[model samples]
Target: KKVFIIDKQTVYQEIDNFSASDAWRCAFIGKNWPQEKKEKIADLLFKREFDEKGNPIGMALTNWRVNIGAGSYENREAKEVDNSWNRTECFLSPDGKYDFTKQAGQQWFMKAARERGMNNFLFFTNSAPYFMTRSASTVSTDQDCINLQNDKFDDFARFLVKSAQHFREQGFHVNYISPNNEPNGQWHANSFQEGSFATKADLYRMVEELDKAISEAQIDTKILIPEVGDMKYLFEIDSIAKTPDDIIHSMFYKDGQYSVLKFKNLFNCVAAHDYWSAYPATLLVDIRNRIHKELSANGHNTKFWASEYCILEKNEEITMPASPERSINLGLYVARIIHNDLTLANASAWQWWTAVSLGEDVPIQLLPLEGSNGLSLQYDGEISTTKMLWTTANYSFFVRPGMKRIAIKPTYKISDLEAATSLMISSYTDGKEVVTVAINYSKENQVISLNCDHAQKGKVYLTTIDKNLRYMGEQPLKKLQLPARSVATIVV
Candidate 1:
């Protein structure tokens, strides 16, 4: 009874990439796990192959985020606040010697991704190198100031840019380097993981030095900035997350005190993580709309990236009654969030927190292994997969980089609260390929006519509670079977 009017003529943002990070955990799993097991995980993430039935089993992820560590694992003092799995070793030693093999586990995954056709790489840092930070560790003092000392700004930037150059020489296409991630969080001396705190001015200082260093080194890599810990810090005067300045106005506005557009090597893109935004359907629409609005008005033509996301909050919609990261309910919640981030925020790229996580407590939508190893941070152990991976594949595997999202008008709007819970849909194209991903969260099946300009017969890939990327064969565009509590991607 519903019709989706999707038209390429009415296009929106050009999709950049769907990505996941190999953060603190990969620093362990990638190096310790057996090649056959690790190779299988790599294939699941980067391969673009199909089963005999023509269903996509590989995620075909377009971008891989390599966490440039800050040497917490090597520091006995720094390891006190965090566990071994949450810590990392830096490439440069305390005495300023470069041992490129320091983060071997992380490099292993990056090389595997590159070998398997994943070209886009974003090297991100949670903290400056331990030797350079004021605290002599990855985590910061309980101060509002950024952990990277003002005097060490130039040195830190050089380290980041040089690392990117070295990785480029190693055959990986290193295109983006994020200097500071989640800058607003306190990142106190005793914290769960490596992180730093920064004011907008401090954030700008870090990027300016980085921008100058990138151009001086003659690298084509662009800088991705101020990976805001929360979405609200990007716009409003947040009451909870403290910020010296609202990110868009302070960092990107032309007339503002510190605008980075004047820098040569900065990409015209700003990133913020989607935390503490998008619950209760109404807040979801309004906040994402506000993000799109703020970036356009104040960001000097800068685009947006919902750079990273995970269920940080325990909400009734996702994690209240059932806390499993592998459930169908959790997968549906993530699908709706991605739909809003793309359509409402007009984000060019969307990325998850990490490709792999350790345990069930953190509800990130990917592999969280505890198989027979019992969730301990051992050197090597068992790994596992879940519904969230296929749920994400409904977008990451199909929409792809360089694809542009066309206008998709469902019979109902997101503001129609029931519509938000019942179904969510979006479409994308790059002329040669057209794809539409639909998430039907209700128990009843949804039969809708897809009005795509390029399709006669549509090829369908469906993932449900029981099925993983099931090929539903070619079907009439007028009536598509979107299974109950499932996500379906129709490719034309």
Candidate 2:
């Protein structure tokens, strides 16, 4: 709606001529984005038509998280009223004990993802099977006795591993499995599946059993523990597993707590979900860098993954109006978070939550418009890309796996007076290939000088949300310009 200056001057001011050392991998998870529809988009994502140079032109399909039975729609009340077991028969739990029907839909979801060059699969359980619980309620349960208790612990863990096996039998390689998801959140029963009161010890036992189950089943899927919803667990791992034998002793730890330190040799990563956190580019960067420092100092070499997050709660300036600008702003914020997380925290992956939701019919329906001028008609199983989807594609489409963050900084005056504000540029390199990311959150466009330490001069290609960041095929290599509050990735 509004136009402003976006040129090389704005880019140089925001980025201090930063260069990339390692070609960072661009990635995204296809969840909730239905099998049939995502299959079409993923085909575009993996097609190998590159430049004159022979670079592998495929977006590595590294991870795809399969939802068990949690309902993405419906009010929290609807989820609470039903007997927790009502929907228990839906998904195919790893252990033979849980239901497998609900999974009929997810089975297709996972299989489709694998067919499109995606290899790694991760399964998430929002709750433990209903029968094992003490209150028999997923939402209104006390914290101390929130989970499946001691008796059915084995059943839950075994179910998870068996689910992994199911995925494998379906011709998909499930690399990792999350036992319990966000146990700390207040959950609903019917619409959403959830379990309660799982301490670090409980998680430790669950993980230990899960590990043994994988070994017994002869599956290579690694165990990821404590799908923590907040950042505290990642910063300080306080025996959150809640078991007597300290079953989590083998995982990463920080100061005797179950921090990211536990991710070394025993586990793959320290899991945390992004909820109730800062959102403005300023706030997000600060919190991200702080967490990164704490983890690194603990001598923990594990990667940080922002498992799941959306912006309605935070990032005021960038909330979705479903406007193109809001989309770009959020895109930049996401890019900044990913940039800071990778460069500062050394995080390995960044993921988005709620791949698709029909909650809003007008602004974003995630399907082609079919309604009148005032209202749009919605179709079941239809697909349309949202602003968030476009923003994610901007990065996930370019940065591939096996890429490393290269050293770079902004030349724009990151004033001490505005210490909390400034342009943040981070880069990743894979030998000859390089990827540089620039985030500009200012009201006006920013100009930044870019450079890399290892290589003297780097070739640059740029694209913006205004340029249809969705269609990379048409995006040509050009100069720079920081679009008000937009994130840009430069591959050199």
Model 2 earns a TM-score of 0.73
What is the Cα root-mean-square deviation between model 1 and the actual structure?
2.6
**Ten residues in sequence with the least summed lDDT for candidate 2:** 16-25
Across 1-492, the per-residue lDDT of candidate 1 in tens digits comes to: 788888788988888888888887777667777678788878888888787778886678888888998888777474333676678788888788887988888899888988888888999999898888878878677666888776999999999988999999988889999988887776885567888888777878887999899989998899998798778787657564447547787677887666787888888888988777768788877888888887888636688998988766777766655444347777787788888888888899888887766543222323325464534444555555566777888898898888999988876654535667788888899888889998897889989999877567789888887877788899998989888899999998
Record all residue pairs in model 1 with backbone atoms less than 3 Å apart, i.e. clashing. none
RMSD of each: 2.6, 8.4
TM-score of each: 0.93, 0.73
- Which residue runs does candidate 2 get wrong by more than 4 Å? 1-38, 41-61, 70-102, 137-140, 188-195, 233-251, 254-266, 280-283, 319-322, 359-382, 411-421, 452-465, 470-479
Please give the TM-score that candidate 1 achieves against the real structure: 0.93
Highest TM-score scorer: 1
